[PDB]
């Protein structure tokens, strides 16, 4: 789509260069670029990912219309992002009707009822984490969060997905661990992804040469492994629903996409939270005290005891305001429409700048401050769920939201129950976000760990 | 080739943007861009046509080494420019050995001896031009130069190439005229050519889909027509040489490339010259008087009488200084080399900025002034043939140089012998060069024509 579009609609934005559009402006990252735009164009604005017109919108009403109201009719899909092969059938990648059919099939698989049943199995890998954390903190050495939580994230993933019970930290050898480690989030600012943003006409070329964003060796192993398992957790609940019709290949797709969506995310948010606890020892203390008041003398966490903890919730939700790892929510516009008096022409990408809104003065007091109290029950009724969107909104939000909260909360409970986390000379203060396309820390967070 | 190259060699130039390199700087045209660079970087400099490193060089010595000395060993070829199909065999497109073989075969076809024989046949279409010029100036109407000279250029081309004698102006119907009209110079700043400069990886794709810069319908007509002619001028002289071996397809290639190279060029320089004569009526007069002193009372021009005319030559050569329609000379570097102490790495494009040098103060007094006197025999020994290069230099210069001068000179003699050319209200004063990639006037030159 040519570069006249936003002039002809009369929408402000940075003047695009030929071929590139505004990509060079990503040298700061999606996160800063989005702020600067909000700051200087106001409430609504447009830019070009190559030839692709992207309309940022920041009106809570409009957001709700896009994310909630017209989701089924107009704004159903995310923007295509690269050669995906069979993963076109993964719920997060799938489109229109085929997506609605898959969302319906998998919805009951993420019931609180089912979650409740998985708690005992997630709980088990708190004990494991604790154990691994004991040894390596008892050494006196500064721990690397990403590897500690990564190993935990996958421990909870392999076990809740495939029933395969492993100690990821003490089994790097295991074939099943080697592969799921490579299932990382894509950095859409790296050279591969920038290129196909500027050469989208290359996606079909790549499709045909069998090249795929989901590495073939990993996808092969997991399909051929689900092949065996099926011959004799999430796998099961899916097997059990066999429009309607979850098919064979559709099932492996989901299995894989649940790993993709949950692994580096969970472990990534967990890191950010421990960083905030270590740099705010008062918040750390207050939580450690709430946990003891509910689970006295290292009592094991449970579904209900987890949902009892206001301060925990406050800390988790406050960390997500600052570090909304999705950064943006997007939908592609299926047809010409008028939303809250605004004309959106077919093919444009509607983008909601979650990270920017999460840090907008209009909604937030001292937005840069880690301040769990914003989420206290007697002072959160003024938080707009269309401004605060770490899991998106509407029929296409994070299907694994409640699973990811519970899982994280179980990590933190066991970890804080046994330990305290502290600053160091390598600990970067304050934290500085990476310049690429993932919301991660520039240098992976290292902290000191002690036995309580 | 990445954008580190000229930093790592320590050569100055404009900082390239990613993917584009310096192409946006072409919004002024090759002509201004080259000046500004010379003006601000000095004698030698580098820029990037997309990912393609281009080394401009302006030292007469270096130029001579590139264009003359190392031509056969290092700098033999021009830069590839697009899908060419069978025209890869045209002498101007052909490479290395295959080029040297074709240059050798066609050299004797451009002897002054052969030229001499074609004079009577070119001469004939002076009479024709005159005739067409009589009528349409006798109307009192302002004449369009490009159509007057275009029609003449092709009249001289069809007849010296294929023996086909036509009145192009009064035969637009003729199949043979319809096609050769479309054989225009390529504008390497237009969208097609800019794209394949930034997507050179697209040339092979285009080759395979049979798409070609030389339009297929025109190339088809000329091949199938040379097909017949051969069954029963330049065609003949080529037929007669049937390494060695001019082949069938190689022959049609040349036939076509001679049309391509001579048609819009000749007519384009001719326009520029009449513009200068009309805006400098003294120079016009002085020439009209030289012509009469050699060819008294409209006597018909001949080879020797044409070569007698110092002032004519002076006017033709002076107009070419200002309007060197090639603009640049280029060679691709076959291997790493050191030329006059300068390291040129393999694959770089050596570019000589003819138009810029033609207007460099260091060599030229009041460079913007149309001043035929710079070329007078008693004041031209200080003109460096490596600064003044309207036909390039060395073994790969314009093979049709002497033909094009003679042909032009025969146009001008007959035209000035019968007429005078004058300014008008539509005549742009002074002339402003186009912003694209051909050195042509922005608005096609219109002048008034009278009977002497
Ligand atoms: C803290 C961890 C997590 C965060 C912050 C997170 C956030 C998000 C966000 C922002 C979206 C996009 C929603 C939208 O477009 O409006 C999303 C989609 C999704 N998430 Fe998560 N997520 C996390 C963990 C998980 C986990 C554990 C799963 C487990 C299966 C999961 C599965 C998905 C799926 C399948 C989608 C796509 C839904 C669809 O297209 O219908 N996520 N997530
Ligand atoms: C005023 C008219 C003309 C001008 C200014 C002109 C100028 C040039 C220039 C600058 C080159 C490039 C030389 C180099 O790379 O160093 C060239 C090449 C060439 N010209 Fe012309 N030319 C004109 C008319 C003609 C005519 C009538 C022919 C007739 C056949 C012709 C045939 C060629 C050919 C074949 C080449 C390529 C030579 C090779 O690659 O070996 N030109 N011309
Ligand atoms: C969870 N997945 C796979 C996404 N759709 N990506 C995202 N925006 N979080
Ligand atoms: C005559 N031809 C075809 C060229 N090589 N182009 C040019 N630079 N004048």
DSSP-derived secondary structure for B304-350: HHHTT-HHHHHHHHHHHHH--TT--EEEE--S-EEETTEEE-TT-EE
A1-452 CATH fold? Cytochrome p450 (1.10.630)
Closest CA to A300 of A402, A410, A423: A410
Q: How was this structure determined?
A: X-ray
* The Cα angle at residue B124 between residues B119 and B127, in degrees rounded to 5: 130
B19 contacts A20? CB cut-off 8 A: yes
Cβ–Cβ of A17/B18 closer than 8 Å?
A: no
From the list A452, A431, A450, the residue with the least C-alpha distance to A442 is A431
- DSSP three-state, residue B443: coil
Measured from the Cβ of residue A356, the count of other Cβ atoms closer than 10 Å reads 23
Tell which A residues from 188 to 247 touch B, by Cβ distance under 8 Å. Answer: 198
Distance of CA A51 to CAs A25, A280, B20, B117, Å? 15, 45, 15, 58
Q: Which of B261, B315, B389, B408 to mutate to test ligand 2, by most ligand atoms within 8 A of the CB atom?
A: B261
Report the alpha-carbon distance of residue A409 to residue A301 in Å, rounded: 9
* Burial status of residue A413 (CB atoms within 10 A of its CB: 0-12, 13-18, 19 or more): buried
CA A351, CA A63: separation in Å to the nearest integer? Answer: 9
Interacting residues of A218 by C-beta distance below 8 A, sequence separation 6+: A179, A180, A182, A183
Alpha helix stretches (DSSP H) within B163-229: 175-182, 191-198, 203-208, 216-229
In a 13 Å sphere around the CA of B37, the CA atoms on its Cβ side amount to 32
SS3 B55: strand
- Secondary structure, 3-state, chain A: CCCCHHHHCCCCCCCCECCCECHHHHHHCHHHHHHHHHHHHCCEEEEEECCEEEEEECCHHHHHHHHHHCCCCCCCECCCCCCCHHHHHCCCCCCHHHHHHHHHHHHHHHCHHHHHHHHHHHHHHHHHHHHHHHHHHHCCCCEEHHHHHHHHHHHHHHHHHHCCCCCHHHCCCCHHHHHHHHCCCCCCCCHHHHHHHHCHHHHHHHHHCCCCCCCHHHHHHHHHHHHHHCCCCHHHHHHCCCCCCCCHHHHHHHHHHHHHHHHHHHHHHHHHHHHHHHHCHHHHHHHHHHHHHHCCCCCCCCHHHHCCCHHHHHHHHHHHHHCCCCCCEEEECCCCEEECCEEECCCCEEEECHHHHCCCCCCCCCCCCCCHHHHCCCCCCCCCCCCCCCCCCCCCCCCCHHHHHHHHHHHHHHHHHHEEEECCCCCCCCCCECCCCCCCECCCCEEEEEEC
Identify from B15, B16, B19 which residue to disrupt to test chain A contact, counting A C-beta atoms within 10 A and taking the largest count: B19
B20 has a chain A CB within 8 A of its CB: yes
Q: Is A265 in the pocket of ligand 1 (CB under 6 A)?
A: yes
- Is the bond preceding B104 in cis, omega lying within 30 degrees of 0? no
Find chain A residues with C-beta within 8 A of B18's C-beta: 20, 24
Q: Note whether A18 contacts B20, CB cutoff 8 Å.
A: yes
Enter the tokens of residue A51.
């030839």
Whether chain B has a CB inside 8 Å of the CB on A307: the answer is: no
Strands A52-57 and A349-352: parallel
Give the up-direction half-sphere exposure of residue A80: CA atoms within 13 A in the CB hemisphere: 20
Distance B258 CA to ligand 2 centre (A): 9
Distance in Å, CA A70 to ligand 3 centroid: 20
Spatial CB neighbours of B145, under 8 Å, sequence gap ≥ 6: B270, B271, B274, B275, B444, B445, B446, B447
Distances (CA, A) of B197 to A96, B79, B82, B189, B388: 39, 11, 9, 9, 28
DSSP strand pairing (B349-352 vs B52-57): parallel
What ligand is nearest to the CA atom of residue B265?
A: 2
**B420: enclosing H helix or E strand:** strand B419-422
Give the whole-angstrom CA distance, residue B394 versus residue B71.
Answer: 8
Burial label, B80 (beta-carbon count in 10 A; 0-12, 13-18, 19+) = middle
DSSP state, B452? -
d(CA B38, CA B31): 11
- Cβ–ligand 4 contact at B92 (below 6 Å): yes
Domain limits of chain A?
1-452
Nearest CA to B119 out of B249, B279, B372, B305 is that of B305
The closest of A352, A15, A52 to A196, measured between CA atoms, is: A52
Strand ranges across the sheet with B349-352 = B44-49, B52-57, B349-352, B329-332
Selection from A343, A344, A317 nearest residue A409 by Cα: A317
The token pair that represents A267 in the structure block: 């472990």
Contact criterion met (CB below 8 Å) for B23 and B348: no
Residue B123: count other Cβ atoms within 10 Å of its Cβ. Answer: 18
Chain breaks in chain B (C to N over 2.5 A) after: 232, 242
Chain B segment 129-168 residues within 8 A of A by beta carbon are none
Cα–Cα distance between B261 and A216 in angstroms, integer? 52
| Measured distance CA(A330)–CA(A54) in Å, rounded | 9
**A114 CA from centroid of ligand 1 (Å):** 17
Give me Rg for the CA atoms of chain B: 22
Least distant ligand from the CA of B268 = 2
Q: Does A343 touch chain B (CB under 8 A)?
A: no
- Taking the CA of residue A398 as reference, the ligand 3 atom at the shortest distance is 1
Structure tokens at B265: 């060029």
Pairing, β A446-451 against β B44-49 = unpaired
Please tell me whether residue B247 adopts helix, strand or coil conformation: coil
Please name the residue that has the structure tokens 């460096």.
B384
Sheet holding B143-144, edge to edge: B143-144, B446-451, B419-422
Ligand 1 geometric centre to CA of A48 (Å): 26
Q: Using CA coordinates, name the residue in chain B closest to A205.
A: B205
Could you tell me the resolution of this structure in angstroms? Answer: 2.6
User: Which string of b and e fits A9-29 if b means at least 16 CB within 10 Å?
Assistant: eebebbebbebbbbbebbeeb
Q: Each residue of B202-221: b (16+ CB within 10 Å) or e?
A: ebeebeeeeebbbeeebbeb
How far off is chain A from B25, nearest CA to CA, in Å?
Answer: 12
- The residue of A17, A19, A202 whose CB has the most chain B CBs within 10 angstroms, and thus the best one to mutate to test that interface, is A19
- Binding-site members of A for heme are 398
- Feature table: binding site of B for heme: 398
Distance CA A203, CA A83 (A): 6
Closest CA to B26 of B185, B187, B212: B187
A44 touching chain B per CB within 8 A: no
CA B426 to each of CA A171, A321, B446: distance values in angstroms, whole numbers, following the listed order = 85, 67, 7
Return the DSSP state at B274.
H
Are the C-beta atoms of residues B445 and B145 closer than 8 Å to each other? Answer: yes
H or E element that contains B134: helix B112-138
Instruction: Report yes or no: A97 and A424 within 8 Å, Cβ to Cβ.
Output: no
Using CB atoms within 10 A of its CB, is residue A421 exposed (0-12), middle (13-18) or buried (19+)?
buried
Question: Could you identify the residue written with the tokens 């960390």?
Answer: A319
How far away, in angstroms, is A396 Cα from ligand 1 center? 9
Yes or no: say if A451 and A418 are a contact pair by the CB < 8 Å rule.
yes
- Determine how β-strand A337-339 pairs with β-strand A342-344: antiparallel
Distance CA B217, CA B182 (A): 10
Q: What angle do helix axes B281-294 and B248-279 make, rounded to 10 degrees? A: 120
Strand partners, A48: A53
Long-range contacts of B289-296 (CB under 8 A, 24+ apart): B291/B413, B291/B416, B291/B417, B292/B417, B295/B413, B295/B417
């Amino acid at each position: 789509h040519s570069h006249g579009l936003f002039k002809k609609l009369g929408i402000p934005g940075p003047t695009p260069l030929p071929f590139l559009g505004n990509i060079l402006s990503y040298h700061k990252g999606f996160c800063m670029f989005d702020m600067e735009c909000h700051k200087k164009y106001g409430k609504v604005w447009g830019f070009y990912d190559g030839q692709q017109p992207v309309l940022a919108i920041t009106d809570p009403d409009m957001i709700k219309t896009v994310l909630v109201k017209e989701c089924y009719s107009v704004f159903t899909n995310r923007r295509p992002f690269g050669p995906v092969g069979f993963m076109k059938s993964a719920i997060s990648i799938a489109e229109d009707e085929e997506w609605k059919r898959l969302r319906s099939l998998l919805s009951p698989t993420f019931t609180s009822g089912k979650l409740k049943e998985m708690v005992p199995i997630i709980a088990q890998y708190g004990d494991v984490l604790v154990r691994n954390l004991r040894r390596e903190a008892e050494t006196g050495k500064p721990v690397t969060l990403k590897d500690v939580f990564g190993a935990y994230s996958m421990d909870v993933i392999t076990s809740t997905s495939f029933g395969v019970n492993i100690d990821s930290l003490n089994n790097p050898q295991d074939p099943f661990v080697e592969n799921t480690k490579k299932l990382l989030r894509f950095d859409f600012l790296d050279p591969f992804f920038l290129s196909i943003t500027v050469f989208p006409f290359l996606i079909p070329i790549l499709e045909v040469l069998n090249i795929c964003v989901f590495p073939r060796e990993v996808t092969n192993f997991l399909r051929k492994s689900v092949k065996r398992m099926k011959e004799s957790d999430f796998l099961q609940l899916m097997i059990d629903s066999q429009h309607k019709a979850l098919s064979d290949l559709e099932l492996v797709a989901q299995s894989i996409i649940f790993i993709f969506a949950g692994y580096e995310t969970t472990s990534s948010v967990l890191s950010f939270i421990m960083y905030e606890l270590a740099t705010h020892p008062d918040v750390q203390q207050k939580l450690q005290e709430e946990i003891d008041a509910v689970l006295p003398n290292k009592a094991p966490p449970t579904y209900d005891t987890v949902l009892q903890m206001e301060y925990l919730d406050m800390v988790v939700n406050e960390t997500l305001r600052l570090f909304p790892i999705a950064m943006r929510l997007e939908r592609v516009c299926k047809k010409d429409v008028e939303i809250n008096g605004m004309f959106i022409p077919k093919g444009v990408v509607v983008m909601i700048p979650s990270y920017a809104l999460h840090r907008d003065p209009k909604y937030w007091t001292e937005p840069e401050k880690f301040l769990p109290e914003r989420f206290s029950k007697k002072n959160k009724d003024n938080i707009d769920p269309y401004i605060y969107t770490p899991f998106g909104s509407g029929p296409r939000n994070c299907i694994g939201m409640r699973f990811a909260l519970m899982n994280m909360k179980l990590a933190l409970i066991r970890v804080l129950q046994n330990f305290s986390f502290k600053p160091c000379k390598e600990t970067q203060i304050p934290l500085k976000l990476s310049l690429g396309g993932l919301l991660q820390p520039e240098k992976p967070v290292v902290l000191k760990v002690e036995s309580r």
